[PDB]
Amino acid sequence: MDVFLMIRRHKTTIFTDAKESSTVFELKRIVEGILKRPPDEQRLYKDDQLLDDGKTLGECGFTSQTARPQAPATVGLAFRADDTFEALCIEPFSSPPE
Amino acid sequence: LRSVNSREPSQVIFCNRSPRVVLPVWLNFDGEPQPYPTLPPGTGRRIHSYRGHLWLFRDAGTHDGLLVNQTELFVPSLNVDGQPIFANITLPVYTLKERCLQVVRSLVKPENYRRLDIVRSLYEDLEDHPNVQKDLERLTQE
Amino acid sequence: MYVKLISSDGHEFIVKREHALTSGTIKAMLSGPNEVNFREIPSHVLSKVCMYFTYKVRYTNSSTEIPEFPIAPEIALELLMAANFLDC
């Protein structure tokens, strides 16, 4: 099953999909291609829960009933190598009027 | 664009696989839309129709268009041999504009569209409700 | 392979090029006769637009039952205008 994500870090947010059987590490790969940053310099979260590279997205809680196209699951991102990785920060979206 | 009158029975089954209350519409031998009883959000029902007839489905409360077996119109076919012909009713992929007009209409009274803070042209688009005769005139003009 | 759409308030959305082409306007803004900056569309609107792109690309011409595209009441009026300008 494809899973639909919204990888987020500091006003930056990536929309991509992957297989539920895909691994956290392979996702860091996809991020590398995009934001040009090696897997080892990035940390991926799920609501303040650091994820293990060997874990499948499925295991990490990203499923077809949770990562839907119309309502993608969110994945936190944090940069800088192991020489002091930044703290996870996600800028919220603007607020509607009314 | 009317039902052919072949007194050949065709047993059909209307399965409503959509979040909406469906209003099936049979097209008259004269081409007039004839509304049948409404199908609740997840139900299905067995219908007696005939080879050659023309059916079309819409949302019962707003006439938004719906699909039946992927196309626009359903025509019951040669039944006898596994018999029941399946009519799968599903939502189409509306455009985002259309989708928003559906949500706003469902929220504001027609008498109040003019109080919304939007372009004059979007006012027109809102008052221009989905319509069956209009869609027929459309398909025909195609 | 990808493209960047930036909201009025600064957020940057990286989406696949095919997905963004879903919008005629964007297909022209870029690839005209990369990035795209929308000085009029806010974050809470552009995030829905991008979600609609994945939704559209995933379900058009599909036998598998289609789910409703959700839209909160507060986002409706602005999404409408965004949708109207983007031609999608």
Swiss-Prot record, chain A:
Instruction: Report the locations given in the UniProt record.
Output: Nucleus
Give GO cellular component annotations, separated by semicolons: Cul2-RING ubiquitin ligase complex; Cul5-RING ubiquitin ligase complex; cytosol; elongin complex; nucleoplasm; VCB complex
Q: Which domain of life is it from?
A: Eukaryota
Residues bearing the modification N-acetylmethionine: 1
Kindly state which keywords UniProt assigns to this record, in alphabetical order: Acetylation, Host-virus interaction, Nucleus, Phosphoprotein, Transcription, Transcription regulation, Ubl conjugation pathway
Phosphothreonine PTM positions? 84
Pathways involved = Protein modification; protein ubiquitination
GO biological process, alphabetically ordered: positive regulation of proteasomal ubiquitin-dependent protein catabolic process; protein ubiquitination; protein-containing complex assembly; target-directed miRNA degradation; transcription elongation by RNA polymerase II; transcription initiation at RNA polymerase II promoter
Predominant location category = nucleus
Q: Which cysteines are joined by disulfide bonds?
A: none
Example GO molecular function: transcription corepressor binding
Q: Which residues form the Ubiquitin-like domain?
A: 1-66
Subunit annotation: Heterotrimer of an A (ELOA, ELOA2 or ELOA3P), ELOB and ELOC subunit. The elongin BC complex interacts with EPOP; leading to recruit the elongin BC complex to Polycomb group (PcG) target genes, thereby restricting excessive activity of the PRC2/EED-EZH2 complex.
Q: Which family does it belong to?
A: Belongs to the Elongin B family.
Q: What does this protein do?
A: SIII, also known as elongin, is a general transcription elongation factor that increases the RNA polymerase II transcription elongation past template-encoded arresting sites. Subunit A is transcriptionally active and its transcription activity is strongly enhanced by binding to the dimeric complex of the SIII regulatory subunits B and C (elongin BC complex).
Q: What is this protein called?
A: Elongin-B
Species the sequence originates in: Homo sapiens (Human)
The major lineage groups are: Eukaryota, Metazoa, Chordata, Craniata, Vertebrata
Full protein: residues contained: 1 to 98 of 118
Curated annotation (Swiss-Prot), chain B:
Quick one: effect of changing residue 27 to P?
In VHLD; type I
Q: Which residues form a coiled coil?
A: none
According to the record, mutating residue 116 to P results in:
In VHLD; type I-II; common mutation
Q: What is the effect of changing residue 26 to R?
A: In VHLD; type I
* Known outcome of mutating residue 100 to R: In VHLD; type I
> What's the reported outcome of changing residue 122 to R?
In VHLD; type I
UniProt-listed GO biological process terms: amyloid fibril formation; cell morphogenesis; cellular response to hypoxia; negative regulation of apoptotic process; negative regulation of autophagy; negative regulation of cell population proliferation; negative regulation of gene expression; negative regulation of receptor signaling pathway via JAK-STAT
**Annotated consequence of substituting residue 105 to W:** In PCC and VHLD; type II; common mutation
Annotated region (Interaction with Elongin BC complex) at: 95-104
What's the impact of mutating residue 45 to P?
A: In VHLD; type I
Q: Could you say which tissues express the protein in this record? A: Expressed in the adult and fetal brain and kidney.
Reported effect, residue 42 to A: In cerebellar hemangioblastoma
In the record, the effect of residue 16 to H is given as:
In VHLD; type I
Q: What is the effect of changing residue 104 to D?
A: In VHLD; with RCC
Q: Which family does it belong to?
A: Belongs to the VHL family.
> Know the name of this protein?
von Hippel-Lindau disease tumor suppressor
Species source reads Homo sapiens
UniProtKB/Swiss-Prot annotation, chain C:
Look up the domain of life of the source.
Answer: Eukaryota
Which cellular compartments is it found in?
Nucleus
| Pfam families xref list | Skp1_POZ (PF03931)
Q: What biological process terms from GO does the record include? A: protein ubiquitination; regulation of transcription by RNA polymerase II; target-directed miRNA degradation; transcription initiation at RNA polymerase II promoter; ubiquitin-dependent protein catabolic process
Supply the PANTHER family for this chain: ELONGIN-C
According to its UniProt entry, the function of this protein is described as: SIII, also known as elongin, is a general transcription elongation factor that increases the RNA polymerase II transcription elongation past template-encoded arresting sites. Subunit A is transcriptionally active and its transcription activity is strongly enhanced by binding to the dimeric complex of the SIII regulatory subunits B and C (elongin BC complex).
Protein's recorded name: Elongin-C
Native source organism of the sequence: Homo sapiens (Human)
